[PDB]
Design a protein around this ligand. Structure first.
Ligand SMILES: Nc1ncnc2c1ncn2[C@@H]1O[C@H](COP(=O)(O)OP(=O)(O)OP(=O)(O)O)[C@@H](O)[C@H]1O
Ligand SMILES: Nc1ncnc2c1ncn2[C@@H]1O[C@H](COP(=O)(O)OP(=O)(O)OP(=O)(O)O)[C@@H](O)[C@H]1O
Lengths: 79, 160, 28, 80, 80
């Protein structure tokens, strides 16, 4: 994936991806969906400038910090 | 930045990103504080968006990639209506026309350029009156240019 | 120059958003 | 107990006076949430009065009350 | 002012209709210039439908355009 995708979880592990605050529900919702069997592909829909990409950086952070399910604890997240 | 490399320089479907993405990455680091700018940023909305260079740019906005644009107020309105995204990255900076007296001040700064350009002397009163003339008789033009046109035109008149 | 709640936010915002009503100028 | 049962009091607190209207509303909202309002029909009312009477205030307070959000309301300019 | 109103004042062309110069005269001026003062000349002869829609700014200082955008410049001053 070199030159195809950015390992958000590595980058956040290394800092740079400043911590996401107040979007814990969006992240939990993302997780509830990722952990589904049906349509497990959540998407963030809303006004621009509210931190939608940032939420995902938050997802990466949550993954790095293992506040995610088994399937995500052993996972990576990319941009 | 824009129009040439971003449009004339295109034959293939990925040419909105080839060269464009290239330069965006070329300038991210080390080579001093490179700032690109767009004089005719109206294009950067895309005709129906479709990432015609326009989305890749803001997509990378989390860092570096410092660019200053320029648009008229109505073009601004149009790129806003036709995009909804670059606006989250770009700061709207309002530019007001100068007063007549201020216009004269720029005319004075510019006066010797015109004397040189045309080989003619210009009176300070030329500049003063040009600016008030313009306010009075050129309602469809802004003072900076209008006053300058009166100067550069007069000078050209004499040059001929 | 500890970022000032009032003067900094108001002034920098005013330069970009106008809002003269937020200035609270000594020239009142 | 407050959410529909003593709605009259919540509405009275936000909308003072207009007790007749408030009681008419109270019956309406109770039918809509008890499920008795027959499913064939959304509850609907015509609020008539004088300017400054609070007739739209009451409707907004109903949205306030029912959704905990007065901005829940959708407005329609029927005169335009 | 005629009943066509839209573009020449506050609303602008309903998006998708020809003429992408939208509310140029008033709304866009506020869009561009956060706030200023507006003067409504001889409102007696303004088209009635327009007098009515301009109420969205008169109170509940909202400014929703045909652009699908909203300015809401309640910071302005209006004189009729
Ligand atoms: N809740 C938050 N906690 C921490 N940082 C935030 C938060 N919300 C926004 N930010 C910061 O503000 C910026 C907004 O990021 P982001 O690029 O997601 O905006 P956006 O909503 O995605 O708009 P767009 O879809 O155009 O990127 C981020 O760079 C992030 O650092
Ligand atoms: N009984 C009341 N209790 C509390 N506030 C009230 C009451 N009656 C009127 N108001 C106030 O009056 C305003 C709303 O009044 P009202 O519902 O009569 O609007 P209106 O005069 O019909 O305006 P519109 O020209 O849109 O109909 C609110 O700002 C509200 O605080």
């Amino acid at each position: 994936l070199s030159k195809y995708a950015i390992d958000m979880t590595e980058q956040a592990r290394q800092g740079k991806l400043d911590p996401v605050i107040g979007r814990e529900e969006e992240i939990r919702s993302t997780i509830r969906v990722l952990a589904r069997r049906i349509k497990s592909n959540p998407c963030l829909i809303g006004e621009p400038g509210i931190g939608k990409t940032a939420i995902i950086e938050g997802v990466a952070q949550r993954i790095i910090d293992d506040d995610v399910p088994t399937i995500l604890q052993g996972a990576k997240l990319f941009s | 930045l824009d129009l040439a490399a971003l449009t004339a320089g295109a034959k293939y479907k990925g040419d909105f990103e080839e060269r464009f993405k290239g330069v965006l990455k070329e300038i991210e680091e080390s080579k001093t504080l490179i700032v690109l700018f767009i004089d005719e940023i109206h294009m950067l909305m895309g005709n129906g968006k479709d990432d015609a260079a326009n989305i890749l740019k803001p997509a990378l906005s989390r860092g570096q990639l410092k660019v200053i644009g320029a648009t008229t107020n109505n073009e601004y309105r149009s790129i806003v209506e036709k995009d909804g995204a670059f606006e989250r990255r770009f700061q709207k900076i309002e530019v007001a026309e100068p007063s007549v007296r201020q216009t004269v001040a720029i005319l004075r700064g510019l006066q010797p350029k015109y004397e040189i350009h045309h080989g003619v002397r210009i009176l300070d009163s030329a500049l003063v009156t040009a600016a008030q003339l313009a306010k009075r008789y050129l309602p469809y033009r802004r003072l900076p240019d209008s006053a300058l046109d009166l100067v550069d035109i007069s000078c050209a008149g004499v040059a001929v | 120059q500890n970022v000032v709640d009032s003067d900094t936010i108001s002034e920098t915002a005013a330069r970009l958003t106008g809002i003269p009503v937020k200035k609270l100028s000594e020239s009142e | 107990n407050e959410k529909l049962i003593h709605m009259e009091r919540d509405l009275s607190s936000e909308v003072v006076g207009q007790m007749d209207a408030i009681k008419a509303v109270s019956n309406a909202v109770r039918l809509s949430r008890s499920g008795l309002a027959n499913p064939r029909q959304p509850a609907s009312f015509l609020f008539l009065g004088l300017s400054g009477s609070g007739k739209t205030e009451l409707a907004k307070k109903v949205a306030g009350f029912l959704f905990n959000d007065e901005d829940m309301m959708i407005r329609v300019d029927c005169s335009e | 002012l005629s009943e066509k109103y839209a573009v020449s004042k506050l609303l602008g062309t309903t998006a998708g209709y020809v003429g992408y110069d939208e509310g140029g005269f008033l709304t866009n001026q506020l869009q561009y210039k956060p706030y200023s003062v507006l003067l409504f000349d001889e409102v007696e002869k303004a088209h009635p439908d327009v007098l009515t829609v301009m109420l969205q700014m008169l109170d509940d200082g909202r400014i929703t355009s045909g652009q699908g955008k909203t300015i809401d410049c309640s910071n302005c001053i209006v004189i009729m």
